[PDB]
Amino acid sequence: MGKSHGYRSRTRYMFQRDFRKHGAVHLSTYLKVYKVGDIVDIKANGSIQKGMPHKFYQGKTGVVYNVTKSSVGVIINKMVGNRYLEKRLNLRVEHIKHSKCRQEFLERVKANAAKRAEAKAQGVAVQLKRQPAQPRESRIVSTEGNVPQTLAPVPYETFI
Amino acid sequence: MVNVPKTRKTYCKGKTCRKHTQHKVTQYKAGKASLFAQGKRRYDRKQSGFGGQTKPVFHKKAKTTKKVVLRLECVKCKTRAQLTLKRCKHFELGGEKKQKGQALQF
Amino acid sequence: MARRPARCYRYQKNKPYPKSRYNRAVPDSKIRIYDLGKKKATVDEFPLCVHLVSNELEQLSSEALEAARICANKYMTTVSGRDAFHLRVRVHPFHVLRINKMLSCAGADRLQQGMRGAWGKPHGLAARVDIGQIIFSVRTKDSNKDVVVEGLRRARYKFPGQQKIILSKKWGFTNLDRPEY
RNA sequence: GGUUGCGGCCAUAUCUACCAGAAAGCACCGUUUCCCGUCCGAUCAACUGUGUUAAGCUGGUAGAGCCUGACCGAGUAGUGUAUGGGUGACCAUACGCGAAACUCAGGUGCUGCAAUCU
RNA sequence: GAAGACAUUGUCAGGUGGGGAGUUUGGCUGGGGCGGCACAUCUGUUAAACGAUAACGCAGAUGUCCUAAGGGGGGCUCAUGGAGAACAGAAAUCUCCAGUAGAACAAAAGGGUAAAAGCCCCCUUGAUUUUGAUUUUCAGUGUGAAUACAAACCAUGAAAGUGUGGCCUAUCGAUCCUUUAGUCCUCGGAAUUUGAGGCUAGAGGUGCCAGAAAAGUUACCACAGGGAUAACUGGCUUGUGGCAGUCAAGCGUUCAUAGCGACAUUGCUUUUUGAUUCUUCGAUGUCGGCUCUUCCUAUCAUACCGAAGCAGAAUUCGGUAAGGUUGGAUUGUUCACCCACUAAUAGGGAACGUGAGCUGGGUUUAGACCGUCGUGAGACAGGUUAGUUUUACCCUACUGAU
RNA sequence: GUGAUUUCUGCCCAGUGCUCUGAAUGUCAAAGUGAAGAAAUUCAACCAAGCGCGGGUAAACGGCGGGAGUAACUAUGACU
RNA sequence: GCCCUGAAAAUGGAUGGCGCUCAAGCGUGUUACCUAUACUCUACCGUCAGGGUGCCCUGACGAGUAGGCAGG
RNA sequence: GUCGAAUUUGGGUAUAGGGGCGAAAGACUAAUCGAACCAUCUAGUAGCUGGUUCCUGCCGAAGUUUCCCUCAGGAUAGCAGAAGCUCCAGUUUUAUGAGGUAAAGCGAAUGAUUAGAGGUUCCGGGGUUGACCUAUUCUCAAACUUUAAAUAUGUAAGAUCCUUGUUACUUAAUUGAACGUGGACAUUGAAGAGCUUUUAGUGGGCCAUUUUUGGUAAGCAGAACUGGCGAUGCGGGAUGAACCGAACGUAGAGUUAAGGUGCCGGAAUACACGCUCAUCAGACACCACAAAAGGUGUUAG
RNA sequence: CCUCGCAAGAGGUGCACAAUCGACCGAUCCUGAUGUCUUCGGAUGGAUUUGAGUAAGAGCAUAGCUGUUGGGACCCGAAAG
RNA sequence: AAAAGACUUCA
RNA sequence: UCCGUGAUAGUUUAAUGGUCAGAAUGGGCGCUUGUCGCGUGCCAGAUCGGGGUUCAAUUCCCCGUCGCGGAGCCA
């Protein structure tokens, strides 16, 4: 047929930054290193030239699975088809930004978590939630078997 | 096409040198005769008529351009290494040559 | 000109199109001028301002725009003379019209191939005139109110989108507009 | 009252009148023989002080620029959702949402570490 | 008799070789050709999308150029418009100020960046070899591409680092065989040489670009099928084409409207033309004409009427209104031209009414000629002469009879 | 090949076709002589008819044009 | 709004028909009726939950071409 | 038409299949000729048309994407099913970035109108001033492609901790984390559901709704998002694949939807009122037409 | 399962299974000891891609059946050579 | 044994 | 009407590598020659209109205007 398919096409709104974001990015962002299990958005800065993902991946959130030299390895899930696999993306730190939402989420659950401990000692807020969590569980916890369980619905039978 | 000079220093792939050393760069045309080739099959297939599979190659498509056609030959060890794909016409050599600058005039 | 009623043009066709790269050799703007009468005059002498406003959402032809506006102008300049009051056209004509231009009989149909096929060869300009939009904004003196109204009536039978004459308010009226000095 | 190292948020810090870090917490000027820049000590690369607050950094003070809000415009333009009306095109209706100007306001920066002061 | 190591025969080599033979002879595509590119592949919009998204959709590029147009670092900051300088206009030039991405960045597009990735000066070769996690390819499918390494090796650089080709988003070739490269394996008693086979890699054509060795004609035709697709009839639409309405610029001596009437504009019809691809390719008989019927109203005449620029009077325009509308010449013609007639010699439909009625002149088979084109076969919406008309009515429909 | 007669049948050998002489110069096969050589394999003396390189050839297929300017009126254009 | 005017077509009249017009029109409110295989329920056949002893029971779901499988 | 000659013809008789035979039409070679016929190879092969024969149950389609001498087909995912294995899915809310399209900014800019007002450059007349053309600059009517803030709206991915020891690690004999282990401690939803083998019909769709893109338009072309038809009965709508109601084992009773109640035709010639008198008119959608112009002293506001 | 407490449940102890990890045996690719010392045969160790081995250990045989290629290949249909 | 053309005026 | 193909001084036509434009004729200029003319010396372009790219455009794109060839099917 006709025309291309193509990485660069349809980027004009996404690639481009605001009047305020315009100008060289700040090397602090370039410098930043992250740990595994951190939650990071991927959306490329227009003002960096290289390290850029496929354009089609921007606005997705992933977890830093591992790092191998300057660029980092991100797990994200795409969509549509049969037995879709989760993807690894090599995407630079300039393009990767923290996510506040889990950080404040983590503080709140943990801040809460202290309030409870005192209640577990001397206090009864609950009671029903208390019953599963002592009987429940190891995993250790923290494992790669839970990932295929999540992986399996992402290829959705109905949508198809 | 492009000036690359014939005598250069670059890395030699071979285990004997393993360092940057002098190479001579050259195009490599065609060679056969031995007959223990495609040529053998042809002799056999052309008797009477056909030839069959020899028949391919030509008539022409045409094209315009080739890609790069090189040996880089060490003169320390006289071992060599080949190069990876690049687009070239043609190629410009001379046993030296610049493309220099300069000036003025021209 | 060449017939097609305005059955072809009036309903709101097309992702616009009139973009400057994408159309060398459009046929002209035929509108003679946009402001008329006393061009050398501010708005503020005139105590009366009359407007003509749309009921429908349309594309008006360039020829209809000039024909309506000249018909109004002949009524104004005959009754109020040459150095009359002052008129402004609200809507200029810049939406570009494609139509395919008269085949052949060669059994050559479209000779193209079979076809048609974008890149249609331009037929001229139109103006978007959407619901409640104002085609003419005319500034006058109350002892010639009647004259502008018949000029606006003689304008209406020269575009197809149904429109209404109206007396304006904007900012102010014309005299809450004036007290600061 | 904080000058300044190193930064971060990076249009609340772009631009154009004029007051201030300063008798031993600056900039300048002077040695520009020279490592050093050359095409000129200008650039720069270096060694230093008559002293001077004029610029410099930055602090003091005023407008166009701009973010942020209040005020109408007042839920207006537009909008997914379910549907009535219109000759057509087109419109409305309930269900959830909601931009443009206007004028007024805040700010001619913020924040953190240290060289840490008369 | 002639002749004689020739010639002729046997065999082979080169050249010619549609006589003959086997074959192929490009896809998309608002019919297939023709024309072209939308055969590979990138863009800016389409695109409502995270991703994936069509049309021969819009606009628009790539099949190169490059050892500097790579690398790195130090050092500088633009395009520019004003001013300033005899001459100089193109006038560089140089100078000063003001100058944030409007410049530069080889090349589309768009994006993107100010001690920069830009500009300059030096120094240099990492445009190295090896392996490539992964994405794009493509959601699993290759080449290719890219983003990251680690080993191997160097550069510049103060060094950290950077540097896995080209401002950024990424810039293309499988497969035999060949070539070449590596150090090494290998070819059947032993033993010695040659040249084979092969390991991993690079290069040599395939742009019919995830890959064939490759031209037409058929009107002498043939076959399988298709209304998945044309000519057609019907239908849809109605640009066109016919006709009407509104408005009324204007002209009519003066006077919009006796009459004529532009621009513009809304309609209506389905009877020209196009458009489509719904219907029919186990078959709808073509145009035209004849003749027989029934109809329509947008009425040409007749009847009744209105207006007039109606004196009469020929008349002009218009309303109501569907109860006749010649015969001929040319042409196959429809159409039309043209002649005398007439009251006037209207237009339209009924499968362009009408082939189980006729006709058969044209279109439109098979033979032939000419112009033109084609090497040729043979072709033209080029012209021309000749060139076929099957069926015994079951049902229905109805003239008539019972 | 053309088409009784009768008057006549003009120009064009560039392409294509065909052909002519080629005792001498660039291309042109094999066996074949030579060179390296254990073999062969590479290469090189030597050329036929053919390409070239030159003449003939249309009652051989066929072919027989392109813009201007210009009359002591204008139109045409003998002529440049 | 209504309505006429704009408003012309071909074998024969219709809004499905007759065709009523303080409606059998059209709009505004409103009362009562009618009406599916729907929904509910009764009985019961398959599947699956299951239970229980070659057999019995509970409740849910349950059109079907291409087509797969399984019992007859 | 020919008919005394290239005439006519009888017998005997020559020439046989890319061959014969031709005053050459591709005519003719025993009803067969752009290549006889007979038999064989043959049960050629045909992405092509047609057909393929008993019941039942549970589930139940696809007409899409890449490749392909490929588009009337293959191929491979895409969409279904069985047979078993093993015991988690969703959603507001939070946070992110993003469609868009209206009025500013940049770039383009038709394109007016334009006052005020500095400066071009020419000549040309008069008493430095001061007529004459271009043109900054603050400054004004709407369009279009970027961008703010978009407003929107669908989206649209995303929802354990500690201590102890021991090991590693990249990075000055230098500073640190973060790795891995070993051990102990303490924490609105509901079967919508994981994996495997093998299997089939495509690999030609259609309509509507919404958002479109081309096309005058179209019972058009070509996308997106979704439902239906295909493969879905039954009830409504005159008829009528995709309009409404409705998803259907059997059978019955009840009551309803959609939609209807003068008659045909269940069921009202219902009730309160108002307009209309043209037979308007008995009409959601629909081959349901009716406009510009709309008169208008029709009625009403 | 047991140790339990018992209509819950954890901690031990043993592991199918699947996911995750390492580790080895050959192939490559690279240092190559011990060394013999004409010659060169080969421990160690690592990186790699692939293939193999252990908790990823098992068939073969016939059977009735499905699919696939085939042979005419479900059946017929053509002009054909 | 020859390069070379026109011609155009006043009883 | 599509696809092909062009255009340069008064006129016909050569030409380029992005930096440079010609010829021939026709004319205007003398001298020849009784006098004109032939001859013989001398002379002189907005490269069709158009916008764009670049350092630099006659030269490279894009469009029109005109003059040309080539198509034209089954009705």
Swiss-Prot record, chain A:
GO molecular function annotations of the record: structural constituent of ribosome
Give the transmembrane ranges. Answer: none
Q: Which GO terms describe its biological process?
A: cytoplasmic translation
Q: Which UniProt keywords apply?
A: Cytoplasm, Isopeptide bond, Ribonucleoprotein, Ribosomal protein, Ubl conjugation
Cross-link Glycyl lysine isopeptide (Lys-Gly) (interchain with G-Cter in ubiquitin), sequence positions? K32
Question: Which InterPro entries does this UniProt record tie to the protein?
Answer: Ribosomal_eL21 (IPR001147), Ribosomal_eL21_CS (IPR018259), Ribosomal_eL21_sf (IPR036948), Translation_prot_SH3-like_sf (IPR008991)
Record localization = Cytoplasm
State a GO cellular component annotated for this protein: cytosolic large ribosomal subunit
Q: Which domain of life is it from?
A: Eukaryota
SUPFAM superfamilies named among the record's database cross-references: Translation proteins SH3-like domain
User: Which family would the database say this protein is a member of?
Assistant: Belongs to the eukaryotic ribosomal protein eL21 family.
Q: How does it assemble?
A: Component of the large ribosomal subunit (LSU). Mature yeast ribosomes consist of a small (40S) and a large (60S) subunit. The 40S small subunit contains 1 molecule of ribosomal RNA (18S rRNA) and 33 different proteins (encoded by 57 genes). The large 60S subunit contains 3 rRNA molecules (25S, 5.8S and 5S rRNA) and 46 different proteins (encoded by 81 genes).
Additional notes on this entry: There are 2 genes for eL21 in yeast.
Record protein name field: Large ribosomal subunit protein eL21A
| Highest classification ranks of the organism | Eukaryota, Fungi, Dikarya, Ascomycota, Saccharomycotina
UniProtKB/Swiss-Prot annotation, chain B:
A single Gene Ontology CC annotation of this entry is:
cytosolic large ribosomal subunit
Q: Which GO terms describe its molecular function?
A: structural constituent of ribosome
For the keyword DNA damage, the answer is: no
Outcome following mutation: P56Q: Confers resistance to cycloheximide, an inhibitor of polypeptide elongation
Q: Which Gene Ontology terms describe the biological processes this protein takes part in?
A: cytoplasmic translation; response to antibiotic; response to cycloheximide
Q: Source organism's superkingdom?
A: Eukaryota
Q: State its location(s).
A: Cytoplasm
Q: What Pfam families does this protein map onto?
A: Ribosomal_L44
Q: How is it modified after translation?
A: In wild-type cells, 78% of L42 is monomethylated at both Lys-40 and Lys-55, and 22% are a mixture of species with either residue monomethylated.
User: Which terms are listed as keywords in the entry?
Assistant: Antibiotic resistance, Cycloheximide resistance, Cytoplasm, Methylation, Ribonucleoprotein, Ribosomal protein
Q: N6-methyllysine: which positions carry it?
A: K40, K55
What is known about its subunit structure?
A: Component of the large ribosomal subunit (LSU). Mature yeast ribosomes consist of a small (40S) and a large (60S) subunit. The 40S small subunit contains 1 molecule of ribosomal RNA (18S rRNA) and 33 different proteins (encoded by 57 genes). The large 60S subunit contains 3 rRNA molecules (25S, 5.8S and 5S rRNA) and 46 different proteins (encoded by 81 genes).
Extra information: Present with 13600 molecules/cell in log phase SD medium. There are 2 genes for eL42 in yeast.
Query: Would you identify the family this protein belongs to, as annotated?
Result: Belongs to the eukaryotic ribosomal protein eL42 family.
Per the entry, what this protein does is:
Component of the ribosome, a large ribonucleoprotein complex responsible for the synthesis of proteins in the cell. The small ribosomal subunit (SSU) binds messenger RNAs (mRNAs) and translates the encoded message by selecting cognate aminoacyl-transfer RNA (tRNA) molecules. The large subunit (LSU) contains the ribosomal catalytic site termed the peptidyl transferase center (PTC), which catalyzes the formation of peptide bonds, thereby polymerizing the amino acids delivered by tRNAs into a polypeptide chain.
Under which name does UniProt file this protein? Answer: Large ribosomal subunit protein eL42A
**Natural source organism:** Saccharomyces cerevisiae (strain ATCC 204508 / S288c) (Baker's yeast)
User: Which gene codes for it?
Assistant: RPL42A
Swiss-Prot record, chain C:
Q: Which top-level group of life is the source organism from?
A: Eukaryota
Q: What cellular-component terms does GO give this entry?
A: cytoplasm; cytosol; cytosolic large ribosomal subunit
| Cited function | Component of the ribosome, a large ribonucleoprotein complex responsible for the synthesis of proteins in the cell. The small ribosomal subunit (SSU) binds messenger RNAs (mRNAs) and translates the encoded message by selecting cognate aminoacyl-transfer RNA (tRNA) molecules. The large subunit (LSU) contains the ribosomal catalytic site termed the peptidyl transferase center (PTC), which catalyzes the formation of peptide bonds, thereby polymerizing the amino acids delivered by tRNAs into a polypeptide chain.
Q: Does the keyword Chaperone apply?
A: no
Print the keywords alphabetically: Cytoplasm, Isopeptide bond, Phosphoprotein, Repeat, Ribonucleoprotein, Ribosomal protein, Ubl conjugation
Its quaternary organisation is: Component of the large ribosomal subunit (LSU). Mature yeast ribosomes consist of a small (40S) and a large (60S) subunit. The 40S small subunit contains 1 molecule of ribosomal RNA (18S rRNA) and 33 different proteins (encoded by 57 genes). The large 60S subunit contains 3 rRNA molecules (25S, 5.8S and 5S rRNA) and 46 different proteins (encoded by 81 genes).
Q: Which family does it belong to?
A: Belongs to the universal ribosomal protein uL16 family.
Q: Which residues, renumbered to this chain, carry the PTM Phosphoserine?
A: S143
Mapped onto the parent protein, the portion here is 1 to 181 of 221
Q: Can you say what this protein is called? A: Large ribosomal subunit protein uL16
Q: Example GO molecular function term?
A: structural constituent of ribosome
Spans of sequence repeats, please give. Answer: 167-181
Q: Name one GO biological process term.
A: translation
- Position of cross-link Glycyl lysine isopeptide (Lys-Gly) (interchain with G-Cter in ubiquitin)? K40, K101
Localization of this protein: Cytoplasm
The principal location of this protein is cytoplasm
